[PDB]
Amino acid sequence: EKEWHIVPVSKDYFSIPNDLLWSFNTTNKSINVYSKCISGKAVYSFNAGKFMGNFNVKEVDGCFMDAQKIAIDKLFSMLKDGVVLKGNKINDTILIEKDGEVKLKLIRGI
Numbered sequence: 001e002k003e004w005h006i007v008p009v010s011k012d013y014f015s016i017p018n019d020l021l022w023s024f025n026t027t028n029k030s031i032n033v034y035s036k037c038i039s040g041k042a043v044y045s046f047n048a049g050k051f052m053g054n055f056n057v058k059e060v061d062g063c064f065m066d067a068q069k070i071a072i073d074k075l076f077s078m079l080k081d082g083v084v085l086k087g088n089k090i091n092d093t094i095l096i097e098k099d100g101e102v103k104l105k106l107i108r109g110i
């Protein structure tokens with residue numbers, strides 16, 4: 001099992017909250033997200049660098065600023081529509097790419 005947090009690259013994501021943690025279990029192929037005010041378990045596909053997933057999200061009312069909510073909504077919508085994941089052979093950082101730009105990066109660890 002590996003975990004990552006997001007560092008936003010695109011401005012649509014500058015208000016994303018910092019405590020979202022993304023987990024991937026290699027044994028059982030499970031992908032979850034966890035945080036104080038959000039959780040989700042992914043139904044997903046990942047083929048040829050293309051990731052698409054539905055996280056079945058739960059969100060705590062009133063916990064987020066309007067700006068955070070919009071960023072969070074956009075994030076899950078984008079992950080549903082599909083993104084390209086770019087890993088590397090140096091470390092476990094992964095770029096999330098869509099529509100010609102890097103949208104965010106996944107950095108290993110809490």
Ligand SMILES: CCCCCC(=O)OC[C@H](O)COP(=O)(O)O
Binds near residue numbers: 022023031087
């Ligand atoms: C916020 C980004 C969506 C979460 C998707 C995710 O963390 O995927 C992990 C991926 O399956 C690991 O495979 P890789 O190490 O071969 O790239």
